Amino acid sequence: TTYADFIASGRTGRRNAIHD
Amino acid sequence: VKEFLAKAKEDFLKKWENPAQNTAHLDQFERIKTLGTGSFGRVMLVKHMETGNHYAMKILDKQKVVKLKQIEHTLNEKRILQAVNFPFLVKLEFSFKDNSNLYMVMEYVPGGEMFSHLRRIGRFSEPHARFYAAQIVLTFEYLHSLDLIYRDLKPENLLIDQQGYIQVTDFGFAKRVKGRTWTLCGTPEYLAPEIILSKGYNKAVDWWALGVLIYEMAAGYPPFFADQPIQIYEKIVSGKVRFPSHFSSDLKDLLRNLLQVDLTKRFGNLKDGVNDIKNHKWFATTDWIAIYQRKVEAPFIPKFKGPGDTSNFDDYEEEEIRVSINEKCGKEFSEF
Numbered sequence A: 001t002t003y004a005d006f007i008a009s010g011r012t013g014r015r016n017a018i019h020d
Numbered sequence B: 001v002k003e004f005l006a007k008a009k010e011d012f013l014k015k016w017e018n019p020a021q022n023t024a025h026l027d028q029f030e031r032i033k034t035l036g037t038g039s040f041g042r043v044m045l046v047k048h049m050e051t052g053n054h055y056a057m058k059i060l061d062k063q064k065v066v067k068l069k070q071i072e073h074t075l076n077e078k079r080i081l082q083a084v085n086f087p088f089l090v091k092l093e094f095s096f097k098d099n100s101n102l103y104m105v106m107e108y109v110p111g112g113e114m115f116s117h118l119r120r121i122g123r124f125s126e127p128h129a130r131f132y133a134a135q136i137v138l139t140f141e142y143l144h145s146l147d148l149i150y151r152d153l154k155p156e157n158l159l160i161d162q163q164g165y166i167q168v169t170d171f172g173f174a175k176r177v178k179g180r181t182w183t184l185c186g187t188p189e190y191l192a193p194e195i196i197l198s199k200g201y202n203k204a205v206d207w208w209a210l211g212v213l214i215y216e217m218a219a220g221y222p223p224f225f226a227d228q229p230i231q232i233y234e235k236i237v238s239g240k241v242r243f244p245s246h247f248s249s250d251l252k253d254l255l256r257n258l259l260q261v262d263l264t265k266r267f268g269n270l271k272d273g274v275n276d277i278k279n280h281k282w283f284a285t286t287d288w289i290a291i292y293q294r295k296v297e298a299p300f301i302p303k304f305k306g307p308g309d310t311s312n313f314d315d316y317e318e319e320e321i322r323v324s325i326n327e328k329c330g331k332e333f334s335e336f
């Protein structure tokens, strides 16, 4: 399930912005 | 609306043309706790000893701002916040600086980050997501009318107040722009296609991020994710999107126009502008003036165990504030 692939990825924490 | 904006534009212009400076000092505030952190600053709960009020104070390391090339951006942020005003915008109450840092004291929003609530709960129901999206819609209509592009919409930057309403935070990329702009900035998952394709862009990027927010709010996850920006960027500039099965048709549709790569076909950036959004089916039940007046029933009310409570914020390693005996970046931040 997408929800699973999501939860299993390294992108469920706070996502910082790219200044550059 | 058009009567409201005009008037509002006039107050902003007043303050925008004569921005306020050095209206407070560090020693007047008592340090209480870190509720957020960043690449060049941290945010702390603070209490103003004279009034006994709690504020959110944003401390920016001036040297970290220079290394990361954010002087102008930082100067933009302060200049816009001391001049804007809206029910869903955090308030820049005071600002000042010292040898080492820049400071922005604002109204404290005890509800915590939508991010947190969103992650913990999994996903919001459409009526719940719709309630917050409306708030973001009006806020963007406000800002936009004043020629400001927000550029950093994301759960992490949205705060829930006491009455259960959202409060936009972080204006590090906000900027008064009449005409194309080129700065590459924001957060990966929320980057419009024009931005990633280095082609100059406009307010239309704020509406694409809106659609991203909504989807993430109704699905529990982002429409474009992977474990590394590039792979996320390909998905973004792909022109493909997949919606969950519970997403209503009106919702899939609304997202289809919002998440349109063809910025000459993307809702919000059309001839009737924002109305293509506000008058969209998914929004049929929304009483916009009601939302603006904060009289609509909040889907969820965060809990406050007392003034200055912080259970809705994570714990961050505390680091003492240091102020060198020498000014570090005088001219760069002279107008702050």
Ligand SMILES: Cc1n[nH]c2ccc(-c3cncc(OC[C@@H](N)Cc4cccc(OCC5CCCCC5)c4)c3)cc12
Binding pocket: A014, A015, A016, A017, B035, B036, B037, B038, B039, B043, B055, B056, B058, B090, B091, B106, B107, B108, B109, B110, B156, B157, B159, B169, B170, B171
């Ligand atoms: C509370 C409160 N009440 N009232 C307020 C009014 C305003 C603001 C506020 C103002 N400006 C910015 C704010 O937060 C920005 C923060 N979400 C940005 C952010 C997002 C994801 C990951 C991050 O670092 C990730 C890590 C990368 C590596 C270095 C450390 C950070 C950083 C918040 C807060 C409050």
